[model samples]
Target: KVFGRCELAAAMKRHGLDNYRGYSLGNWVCAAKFESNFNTQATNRNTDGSTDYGILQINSRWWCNDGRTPGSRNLCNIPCSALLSSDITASVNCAKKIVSDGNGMNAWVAWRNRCKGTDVQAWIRGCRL
Candidate 1:
């Protein structure tokens, strides 16, 4: 199922993305919107033969194994398809792995463009976190 803005905020907070890796929960919300419009089933194919999956639009080239990308790393050791589910726990867990590795939120252009160095508070302003 897709999420409403605050619904995603609440989910992100409960699932451990809140202030994760120094990025605020609002940043997560803003980035997620630009990436997938809060659609759990979101999928994007990059020109580099990698795919982005889930609400956070995680990359298959390094994060998840889609068995299609060349030199797929599967750093999260999870199938890319798992990120497409509505549960979101696996998605959140793997996203943490992205930042925990020091890759930072820059791995996502959406995050960098809409969230980085900006006040994301508006995304969370009315959300129940």
Candidate 2:
């Protein structure tokens, strides 16, 4: 019901990496499983007293100014509410721009290759993303 996994997969697909050979839904799912277990509202407290949030572990507070709810940030900024919005495709597009701007598609490719094999579950463990 959280839509975290759904949005994450959508984001990855928008990046044109949503294919098994490179970066696919399977690949993004593998990353989410480890990053936040598919929980968009999830967060982690760092040793430095910082936090990482949402399905992609996006560091909502620092990177996106989502200090309260992930939904609180401006849509032009983080678009966290996009996870819950009806326009999933738009959200994915925004996420793609963010990730691509950071030159993260190659990281996604690396994640996919590290887990290259027959099964997605195995891929998740081996990818180390």
Candidate 3:
């Protein structure tokens, strides 16, 4: 497990996520909460037979390789397991790249389904940077 939301916010800010890729930190935090509840080891099997990895719930179909699957684009060129660690540096970096790929946070179904158009400030309320 990672730190609480506030600590995650501070770490995300320290790692340049406060305003990275033109997205708000609140949105990022909110998405993360919905995606993995800040747990790096989180994984979920998708209906498409692919698995989502880590705090960002990045898909094995496009971003990382789960080894059990084939034809992964693997634009990040990292193992899917790397995303499932308490240290989220790799996960954050991969998420940055994912956002940079022009989908924004829309790349994450959790964000689109849960966090989009929602009031997200509470996700970072007590985290005074």
Candidate 4:
């Protein structure tokens, strides 16, 4: 399932992403936009044999167990399929883990190159969040 901008804002916020650890809900929305374009089923395979799954593009190598990701720790202890759900519960949960794991939101390069230093608050408020 894919979500419209305002639709996604409501969803992520409801699951507690609104300023979770100082990264605003808009920051998360922006990351989702750039990462998966709000498509719940999005997946991307990397050259190093890691695959990113779901809206936040949680990596299979350490975050999600994709079965084929080499040496995966499954740190989130969830199958990659959980990340692809339109519910986004597991995706957002694992995302919080990633942030507090010392990586910060900058762990997602999309947030850095695309969302950082920009007025994401206003941009996302345009979504009416």
Per-model CA lDDT versus the true structure: 0.91, 0.50, 0.87, 0.90
**Best-first order by lDDT:** 1, 4, 3, 2
Q: Candidate 3: what lDDT? A: 0.87
Report per-prediction Cα RMSD to one decimal.
1.0, 7.4, 1.1, 1.1
Clashes of each: 0, 1, 0, 0
Candidate 4: misplaced stretches above 4 Å?
A: none
What lDDT tens digits, residue by residue, belong to model 3 across residues 1-129? 766899898888888898788778989998899899988899999877789999889889988988866666787889999999888888899999999988788988889999889887778887788
The digit string of per-residue lDDT tens for model 1 on 1-129 reads: 799999999999999998999889998999999999999999999999999999999998899999999977999999999999989998999999987776699888889988888889899997656
Q: Which stretches of candidate 1 lie over 4 Å from their true place?
A: none
lDDT of 2 by residue, 25-78 (tens): 665676656665666556676555545555555544434554554443343365
In TM-score terms, candidate 1 sits at 0.95
Better of 3 and 4 by TM-score: 4
On lDDT, the leading prediction is 1
* Candidate 3 minimal-lDDT segment of 10 residues: 66-75
Better-scoring candidate (TM-score), 1 or 3: 1
Between candidates 2 and 3, which one is better according to lDDT?
A: 3
Clashing pairs in 3: none
With candidate 3 superimposed using the best TM-score fit, by how many Å does residue 1's alpha carbon deviate from the native? Answer: 1.6
Task: Single out the weakest 10-residue window by summed lDDT for candidate 1.
Answer: 99-108
